[PDB]
Amino acid sequence: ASPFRLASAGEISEVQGILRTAGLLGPEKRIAYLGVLDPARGAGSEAEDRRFRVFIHDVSGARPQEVTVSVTNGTVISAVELDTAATGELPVLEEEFEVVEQLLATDERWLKALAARNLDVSKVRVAPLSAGVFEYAEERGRRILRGLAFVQDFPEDSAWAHPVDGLVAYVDVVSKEVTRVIDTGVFPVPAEHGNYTDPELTGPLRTTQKPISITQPEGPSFTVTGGNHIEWEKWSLDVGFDVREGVVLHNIAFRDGDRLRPIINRASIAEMVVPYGDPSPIRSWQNYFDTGEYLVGQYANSLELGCDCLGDITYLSPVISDAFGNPREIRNGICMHEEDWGILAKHSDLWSGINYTRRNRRMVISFFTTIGNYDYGFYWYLYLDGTIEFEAKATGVVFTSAFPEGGSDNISQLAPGLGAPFHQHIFSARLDMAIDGFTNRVEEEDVVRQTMGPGNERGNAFSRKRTVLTRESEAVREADARTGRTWIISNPESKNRLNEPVGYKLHAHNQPTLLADPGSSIARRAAFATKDLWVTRYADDERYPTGDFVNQHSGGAGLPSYIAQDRDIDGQDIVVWHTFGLTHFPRVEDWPIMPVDTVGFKLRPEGFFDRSPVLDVPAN
Amino acid sequence: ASPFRLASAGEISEVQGILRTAGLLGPEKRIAYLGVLDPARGAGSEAEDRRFRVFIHDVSGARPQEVTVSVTNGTVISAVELDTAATGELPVLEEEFEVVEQLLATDERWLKALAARNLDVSKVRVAPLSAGVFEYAEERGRRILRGLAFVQDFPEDSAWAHPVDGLVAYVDVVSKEVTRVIDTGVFPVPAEHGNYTDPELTGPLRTTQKPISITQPEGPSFTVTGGNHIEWEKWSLDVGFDVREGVVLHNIAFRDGDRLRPIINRASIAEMVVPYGDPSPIRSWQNYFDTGEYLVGQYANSLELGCDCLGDITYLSPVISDAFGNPREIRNGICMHEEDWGILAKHSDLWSGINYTRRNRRMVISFFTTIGNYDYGFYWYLYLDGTIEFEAKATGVVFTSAFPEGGSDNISQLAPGLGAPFHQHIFSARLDMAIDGFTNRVEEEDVVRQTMGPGNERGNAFSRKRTVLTRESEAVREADARTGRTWIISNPESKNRLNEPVGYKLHAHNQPTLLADPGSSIARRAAFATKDLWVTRYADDERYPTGDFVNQHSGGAGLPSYIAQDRDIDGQDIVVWHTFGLTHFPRVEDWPIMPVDTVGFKLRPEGFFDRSPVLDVPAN
Ligand SMILES: [Cu+2]
Ligand SMILES: [Cu+2]
Ligand code: NA
Ligand code: NA
Secondary structure, rough: OOOOOOOOHHHHHHHHHHHOOOOOOOOOOOEEEHHHHHHHHOOOOOOOOEEEEEEEEOOOOOOOEEEEEEOOOEEEEEEEEEOHHHHHOOOOOOOHHHHHHHHHOOHHHHHHHHHOOOOOHHHHHEEEEEOOOOOOOHHHHHOOOEEEEEOOOOOOHHHOOOOOOOEEEEEEOOEEEEEEEEEOOOOOOOOOOOOOHHHHOOOOOOOOOOOOEEEOOOOOOEEEEEEOEEEEOEEEEEEEEOOOEEEEEEEEEEEEEOEEEEEEEEEEEEEEEEEOOOOOOOOOOOEEEEEHHHHHHHHHHHOOOOOEEEEOOOEEEEEEOOOOOOEEEOOOOOOEEEEEEEEEEEOOOOOOEEEEEEEEEEEEEEEEEEEEOEEEEEEEEEEEEOOOOEEEEEOOOOOEOOOOOOOOOEEEEEEEEEEEEOOEEEEEEEEEEEEOOOEEEEEEEEEEEEOOOOOOOOOEEEEEEEOOOOOHOOOOEEOOHHHHEEEEEEEEEOOOOOEEEEEEEEEEOOOOOOOOOOOOOHHHHHHHHHHHHEEEOOOOOOOOOOOOOOOOOOOOHHHHHHHHOOOOOEEEEEEEEEEEEEEEEHHHHHHOOEEEEEEEEEEOOOOOOOOOOOOOOOOO | OOOOOOHHHHHHHHHHHHHOOOOOOOOEEEEEEEOOOOOOOOOOOOOOOEEEEEEEOOOOOOOEEEEEEOOOOOOEEEEOOOOHHHEEEEOOOOHHHHHHHHHOOHHHOHHHHHOOOOOHHHHEEEEEEEEEOOOHHHHOOOOOEEEEEEOOOOOOOHHOEEOOOOOOOOOOOOOOOOEEEOOOOOOOOOOOOOOOOOOHHOOOOOOOOOOEEOOOOOOOOOOEOOOOOOEEEEEEEEEEOOOOOOEEEEEEEEEEEEEEEEEEEEEEEEEEEEEEOOOOOOOOOOOEHHHHOOOHHHHHHOOOOOOEOOOOEEEEEEEEEOOOOOOOEOOOEEEEEEOOOOOOOOOOOOOOOOOOEEEEEEEEEEEEEOOOEEEEEEEEEOOOOOOOOEEEEEEEEEOOEEOOOOOOOOOOEOOOOEEEEOOEEEEEEEEEEEEOOOOOEEEEEEEEEEEOOOOOOOOOEEEEEEEEEOEHHHOOOOOOOHHHHHEEEEEEEOOOOOOEEEEEEEOOOOOOOOOOOOOOOHHHHOOHHHOEEEEEEEEOOOOOOOHHHHHHOOOOOOOHHHHOOEEEOOOOOOOEEEEEEEEEEEOOOHHHEEEEEEEEEEEOOOOOOOOOOOOHHHHH
16 A cells, blocks of 8 residues: 555556546547656655646647546546646657658658659658757747658668758648748768668677576565565665656665665656757757657566566566556566676785675666667666666667768768767756755765875875755756765764764766757756756655756746745755766767667765675675 | 796796896895786797796895896896886885884884883784885885884784874884884774674674576686687687786787787786875875785785676686795686676667667676785776776775864764775776777867857757877876867778778776875876876886886886877877776775775777677577
C-alpha cells in the first residue's frame, strides 16, 4: 500500500472510465500526457489519495485541458481550459509524427522540389521535428511540426545516409495543412549507404571474442517488495516511472545503524535539450526538448537479456497510457542489477603487518529510449560507500546533412558529400534534496590559493572557502574547474559526532553549457542550460526547468520565473537543478552508427557519516 | 627474441656478475636503481643489445656512479661519477628507511621529547620521509631523511591514529647522525584507535552480499606470447615493468585491416608528487615524489585472486634487483583481464525496422603499490572502439596530525583531536606519441562561441578552432574547461579517406594543478605540475619530468630545462606530458581507512579510422 507504487493497468483504465463518465474523453479527444502525482508534503493523512494529472488534446481544434483525477475516490478534481498561445502547446502525439510525411507526399510544392532532384516520392522519408518559436507569426496558437527529408533506397536502408539538403517544410498537424515549403537549392544526395548490418560494409565478423559469464548463483543481494521498493546494502528507495521524465527515484535513504536517514526525496532528469549549431536556414531552428516535447518515457525500449542488460537482471515493466486512455505495458523497460566495481579500500601496513582489501559494488537502475535517430541511456548508480551517480549514454545515428563544397565551420564531414552538423545534448537533473530531513542549505566550495609570506613562509599552504547560498537571487551558479569548485548540500540542524553539519558534495564534470547567443530563441526557452547550478525553494507546481508546456512556448518559463521569487533557501526545503551536457563535434568514427559517449555527475558524502560507512563489508 | 621482453632473473644475475668482475660492486656498494634501457630509435640493427642502466650507492660516503652495462656482450659501457650536490641524490634505499627509527631511539633530544609527553620509546614508530630542499645549508651533498612520530599501542595497532604533533627530526642516513630535533610544543596524542579489523569498531559484518561470479569458460580473448606481448581485439602492445615507473606500455598499435598502425610508442606515469598544504613548521617541508624518490615499482603488491583482481586473470610476475644485485620476483605483481563495459552502440530504427545492439569490453592492465600509509592503483584500459584510458585509484590511510584547538584552515578533523592535513596527489603521464608513425603534431582545440548577426541571424551557431603548437616555447598549455579545451595529436602526413590528417584527442579531467606558491621550493622541483600539458621533441635522455635524480635536487631540472631548447615539434617525433591530480580535503568518511577516489585521462580516435572500427563486432 505504498503511495509511491507504480501505476497499474487498472488505475489507468479507471482514469479512462472516470474521464469518459465525466464527458471529458469523447471520440475527438486524445491523452497527450498522463502520470501519477507525488503525495503532498506531510503524508500523515492516513490512506493515500492516488491522483493523476492528465493533458487532454482535442483533434477538432477545441482548447485542450489540464485535468486532475483521483482514482481512490473516482472523481475529477479539477479541469482547466488551456490558452496554448500564451502558455505553450501540449507534447507531441505519436499519431502526429506519421502525419507529416503523408501530407507532404501530396503537396505540389514538395512534389516539385523532389522532381527537380529526380527523387521518387515513395522513397523519401520525412523526419518530423518539433517546431520551436521563431519569426513566423501565423504559427502562434497552432500545432506545428517541421520536416526534413531523407532518401531510403529500399525498405531496409538507413535513410540517415541520404539527407536531402536545401529543403524543409512546415506542417499544421491539426488542420492537416502544409504551411510552407522552403527550397534554398539542390545539393547532391550522398550515395554511400550507411547499413551497419550489411556484410559488405562490416566485413567478416570477428571470431576472437570469448564469452564473459556474469552470474549470481545465490541470486542478487537486493530485494524488491511492493512491486518497486528496493533495499540493497543499506540503501532504500522506490523506483518510479513517468511517461515524461522516465525513471524517477523516490525516498533515497541510507540505513545508518538503527535509523533510516534520508538523502534525496526525488531525483529525475527533468528536461533535455539538443540544440544544433548550423546557421543554415534549413536547420537553424533545429532544437528539441526530448523530455518536455516528446516525452522520453513513452519511447523506452524493451531491454533484452544478454544484449542490453548482462548479468542477473531484475526487470520492471512500467505501465503508461496510450492516446485513448488504454494501458500499455513497456515490457522489460527498466533493468536493475548489481555489478562489481573493483577495489573499495586497500592498505598493506608495514608496522601492523595487517593486509586489508575489500571489493566495491554498485546497484544499477537503467532504461533506454529512442527518438528518431537518437538513442539515450539513463543510468543511476548507488555505491557501497554512499556515492550516488548518474550517467547519460548517447548513441544512435548522427543527424546528417550535405557537406558543402569548400567546407563548413559548423558541420563535419563523415563520408564523401555527407556532413553532420555540430550540436549539444544537455540534461537537467532535478534533485529534491532531503539531507537528514528537509532543512537543507547549499554552499559553494572553492579551492583557495595562498601567497608566500608570514604564517606560510615556505609557500606551501592552501585552503578552501564555502559560501552559503541564502536566497534564490544568488543561487544561479557557474562552474569553475580551475578552482575545483563544488557544491555541498548540508543540514545545519543535523550534526555528525564532530559537531559539524552533515552534508553531501556534488561533483560536476564542468563541460561547456549552452553555447547559443544569449539573445537567441533557444537561450530564452532553454534558459536553465545557460548555468551549471540552480537552487530553488520547493513548491509542488515547480516540476520542470522549462515549464509544464514546452512545445512551442516563447521562453522564460520555468527556472528564471521560479528564481525571481527570491525565496529563502538557507535551511529550507530546497531543490537542486544541475545542468550538464555533451558538446558533440561528430567524428568519422561516429559513422555509420556511433559508439557510446557519456556525461553525468555524482554526489559523495561529506561529513554525513561518523566514519567510513563500509567498515562492515566482509572479505569474501 | 623481442627487445621489449621483461628482464629475466638471469639478466639481473649477469648484470651483477659483470659489475662484480669490473670492480664496481664490492661489499660497500648498493644498487639504488636498475632497469633495462629502451632500444634506440631505428631498431634496424639486427640482434638486440640488451643494455641496463644502474645507479650505484656507496655506503661509506664515496661518490655514487651511473653505470650502463650490456648483458648481450657482458661489458660495462660507461661509468660516470656523480656530483650529488649539483645534480641530486640517488633514490631512497629500502634499508635506509629502517634506520631513522633506530638512531632516534638512542638520541637524547628525541628521548627527552618523548619523556615530556610520557611516551614509551618502544611504542613510537617513525615514518621516514624524503627530505626535499629548503634552507638548511648543512644538508647539501648529504643523504637525509626526515621523521615524524606515531604511537603504536600494541604490535597490531594502527599507528596513524596516534600522531605525535609538534615533533620532527632530521637524520643523516649515511653517517648515521641525528642532525636536528625540533620540538615546537606538546599536543595531546589522539586516543581513539583506528583499527578497521577490530569487531568493536566494525560491528558485525554484513551477511547481505551475495557472490558475483565472473568466469570465462573458454578462457580470455587476449593472448600472451613471448612472456609479455599482448594481442586483444585488434590491439597489440608489450607490457614492460620498470622499478621506478612501474608498468610501462610499449608499441601500442591497432590492426586496421591488413596493416598494423602505431598509436603510442611508450606510455608511463613518469612522476608523482604529493605536496602538503599545512603551513606548520612540523610538516611544511612534507613533499614526496613517490616515483622519482622512492621508486613505486619496487613496492608493488602481490595481487590476490578474488580480492585484488576478480575474473579470469592472467598474471605477470616482474623481476627486479635488490640492493646487492640479486634478482627478486614480485609474484602476481601485474593483473590483466578483460571486463564487460556495457553498451557499445545501439539504435532502434523505425524506418528500417532494424534493431541493433552491441556490447563493449575493455582490456585491463593494473598493479598496486604501497608507500607508508598510501596505496595507489595504476590502471590502463583499452577499449573496443580505439579508446585508451588511464585511471589512478588512491586509497590507504590518510596522513594524520593533531587537530588544533580552535580549528585550522589547512587540516580537517576526522576524530576527536585527530586531524588530516590538506594535500594533493599529482601524476605526470609521459606519452611518447607515434600516431601512424613518428611525424606528429599537437593542436589545441577550443569551442568557439559566435555572436548573433549576419550569417547567424538566429544566434544558434557555434564552432571550434585548432591552434598548432609549432615550437616547444609555445607548448606549455593550461586547461580551460569552460571552452571545452582538448588537444589533438595528429600525423600531417597520414590522411584518412576524407583526406584529413589522422588523429587522437586527449580528454583531461581539468582538475586543479599544483596549488603551492609559484616561488616555493616545491613549485621549483615539481615544475611540471604547474601546467596541464607539455610537448617536447623526443630525446633519449629526457625520460622524467623532474630529471634523473629527484631526491634532494634544488629544482628546475627536467621539463622546464627540456622546453628551453625551443625545438621544432610540428611534424616531428614528439612526447606529450600530461599533469593530472586529485586535491584531497580529507573527509570523516576517509577515516579510519579511505574508500578509493580516482583521477585520470583518456585518448579517443579523431579521424584516425575511415569509419567506426567496431562494425565487425558480433551480437552474442
Ligand atoms: Cu550527438
Ligand atoms: Cu590523499
Ligand atoms: Na527538498
Ligand atoms: Na614520439
